[model samples]
Target: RTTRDDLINGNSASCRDVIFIYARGSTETGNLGTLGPSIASNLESAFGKDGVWIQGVGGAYRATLGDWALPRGTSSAAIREMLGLFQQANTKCPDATLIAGGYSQGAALAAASIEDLDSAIRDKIAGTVLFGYTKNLQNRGRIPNYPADRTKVFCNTGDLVCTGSLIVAAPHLAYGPDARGPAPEFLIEKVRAVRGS
Candidate 1:
């Protein structure tokens, strides 16, 4: 609760010029409540308060493990939602800077959505920061067409989900340092450069 408050209240204090659409990962129970917001928090410091933050439901779905239901999201639906948001943003704010990203499953969606973006709209985005991207999916996911220099992918050394080489949980949750440090800094640099500062 407090975290989202920070995202809202914090952006209100800054210029808030960017529209950031972030996708959430699996097992998240609330809308706009998850690690996705935390990554946005890091960006809020640089993008300002007027920056509208929208959350995507790429990780929302019902799954069952041995008849034990598990809530999992469908990437196709999320991708559609994200693409719509991007189209809407471009139509409403033709010149506004835009950014999008996600974690785990959401990260995969971010990667997927960017590939489908219209070239004109794709060129306007500041950059994308993807965390815990599933290595297996990346091989099959359509690679983004945006400038490679502006995109950053964060994968922990041995995360089983990102590496697909092991079955474990620890590595998947260790993106704090990258999220808090490099990721935000990377976005900040792009944002500043775009603004000609």
Candidate 2:
């Protein structure tokens, strides 16, 4: 029999029901809870044991230090680590669906990983849910190379996280005229709605 420990030993097994690729806010790395506690708790209650929140913390900023105006995130070895976790999830849940999701900067990573998955395995995902995200990556619009029928994206108005530079589809949903970051919880609700849980 293939024991759980054995799967871990050989880096083979399909254990997770789904994967949640989260991006970071303006904080130190390794703090998955930085977006706040309610976000995780609410998601957990909705998805149960099938969800794994994969937090991302990259190091390449858009401009020199202290330049939040031209804000751009760090793209580093973190992408490799993100891939490693996705591979692990595939091994643990061969037949299970994988979901890549996140908020603010995390939302961007979630969108990025979607295109990075093997074409065959990409179909195994139920779909993607992005909050606090807009299309702005270099090669792709708000949704870069998105699968025709399975990807769903969400964004809020006045998300300070989505400051100056805007995605093409952004003007369609910017909710208010405020300059501060929109309440994270408000977007979390949008995520839950996307999951339908």
Candidate 3:
């Protein structure tokens, strides 16, 4: 459940039922579950078995130490980066249910990415799940243009990071299990809503 680079590297000939365009939190290199794959694993089981495709953003601009700075996230670099990646994924698998998400800094990236996207691309995304979100306070717990019903955030109590404060507490670090249990159903439901399956 780690090192899933199919989407970013342009491999969609074998498109799956779902495509999760994701990014990691600060300092998270390459691993399925910087809390992502845990949710995907459960999501996979829901679809009869290993049926999820995950694409983690490139390290060159995914998350920087500056992301640990403050509520004002880094630039739109990663934001635009994810937008471009999602375009490719969608182009390759127009039939797949698309979802975008990330943890903390990556969460911010995912949120920013959705705003400037072509309406067609934005509409294709079935849902998003951002954990330990960095822009919760600024966005008022919402990602612009994306429907509230199609989004879920896991900013546990004591996780000051979500409130615009720059503190990573145990609540922020413990999102894997917190999100793992609920994300599959959320994702599955959202995808079904869009795919009618």
Candidate 4:
């Protein structure tokens, strides 16, 4: 049967206490890719398997490194999916909290999704974690009015992707290690705050 465990391993899974949505980077495997699932596992480890439902955004669309060169709106559909997921989680489980994360192009998608959400659903957003965010430089590492206190952007030193440079390399791919430690830890801390335990 479809369950939170299914969401962690694959695509959409039903609600748990938390609805964790992730977006994968360019040319990565699965919707969760490598980094997204890494953080998802850590979250489940902290909250137990059934406590969080990890849903990776569907379709790679066309978030090539080339798009980063010119900077276009290539992933609008992916953004829409992220938005839809927000309403789904908000509708599915009112008592549940939301945590969003993405890597590379998907990192931008995560932030965009957060920016577009209605105020009614904003408070449910316990935290947002982004790795190798493409627009980290564009917005000076901040998403306008979205409280900086609730967000964490992990752009590695010299990572061109975060620097708004098209010359992406190993620095962009090194977020896997961050997901294991600091990334998930940040999400859990926010999730913990929302639940008041």
Candidate 5:
């Protein structure tokens, strides 16, 4: 049987040059949709030493509504997994940097995960980028605790997801196409900052 300590230790190989936790939006699977993959690929291009480590977190799928209403719980699980990975990586690669963020419901996951992290661990995180983040949560102060300077929340004007509209999936899908180019640049800057300091 796998022991609790074993799970916490994580896999040594997971400690790469940089770690990126990409949480998929509701019902989206296989690398958390295009937004995550696009950003991950670009990060690899900018910096490669075995490239970046990308971890995708899966959440419940509500077929009827197609929404991740349970992001707080799902995102919390992702946070636990990421922290374990961070602990294992720190054991081997003390310099390894962390990057976490997502789109739509996954964006909430990203925020909720890091919001309450211990400063020591949170400090290791380079930055967080939330696309299509739900405005309700932001208004409620559920956003991550990362410094404002290091966090990026992108919301398309009139996007219902961020605005609490809860309509069909039109505005939420807009992020990937436009954010692809800028997302990587933002991560790149944060990664360099962490590594530099």
Candidate 6:
């Protein structure tokens, strides 16, 4: 039985809430542990590692990051799997709230997952964080909807990946966060402060 407990260590054994962060890009496995640690650490600091469940796509966490190595539309299939993870969260923690975040391709998946969920389930979402993405704007009224609101997106001015116009809520940053100054850790502190940490 592949339980959430299996993916996370001791602190996450009894989590009643979940914060699923997915990583983006072609580079899988070899880089996830390194890429996701900061975001994971931030979430753990806020919610306690035991009270949160962080899920990465193929590269970052578990669940076959391999399938997402890009080409045509594997992203759509990958997004579906992400929905499954959210569904699992609903089952495992009936009353649990979820906060899903993603970077790059994972940002798209996060958007897709939130859009696919039922309104009731959608309401359960505490928030979402997206870094390095701007699809809808690029499509210019073609892609339909893109999710953005209380959600936070980080980007720097020099990130070429995020160029071009967007449709739905485009990220505020002209460049992804890596190009800018304050790191995710800084944002995490701001979030904690707002939450009265």
Best by TM-score: 3
User: Can you give the lDDT of residue 164 in candidate 5?
Assistant: 72
What does each candidate score in C-alpha RMSD? 5.2, 8.5, 2.2, 3.6, 5.6, 6.8
Residue 191 displacement in candidate 2 (angstroms)? 12
For residues 1-197, could you state the per-residue lDDT of candidate 1 as single tens digits?
31232222333334246666666555553444356556677766665555545444433321111111112223455567767767766766666677776777666666667778898988878888877775434453324576767778787777766655424478787777776788777877887788765
The count of residue-pair clashes in candidate 3 stands at 0
Candidate number with the higher lDDT (3 or 5): 3
Q: Write the per-residue lDDT of candidate 5 for residues 71-92, one digit (tens) a residue.
A: 4534445556555554554566
Candidates 3 and 4 compared: the better one by TM-score is 3
| Residues 83-193, model 3: lDDT tens digits | 788788778988777887778888887888887788888888899988888889889899988889889998888999888887778888988676678766687889888
User: Which model scores highest in lDDT?
Assistant: 3
What residue runs in model 1 are displaced by over 4 Å at the alpha carbon?
A: 1-16, 51-74, 140-142, 165-168
lDDT of 2 by residue, 1-197 (tens): 10112123332343444344444433323434244233444545555634444333233322122222232332434444555656665766575455554444555555556567666665655555555553333434355556644554454455444443433244433422211133333433444445555
TM-score rank, highest first? 3, 4, 5, 1, 6, 2
Q: Residue 111's C-alpha lDDT in candidate 5? A: 70
Sort order, lDDT high to low: 3, 4, 5, 1, 6, 2
Candidate 6: stretches off by over 4 Å: 1-13, 30-34, 59-74, 134-136, 139-147, 165-197
Query: CA lDDT of 168 in candidate 1?
Result: 42
Candidate 5 structure, TM-score to reference: 0.76
CA error at residue 143 for candidate 4, angstroms = 2.4
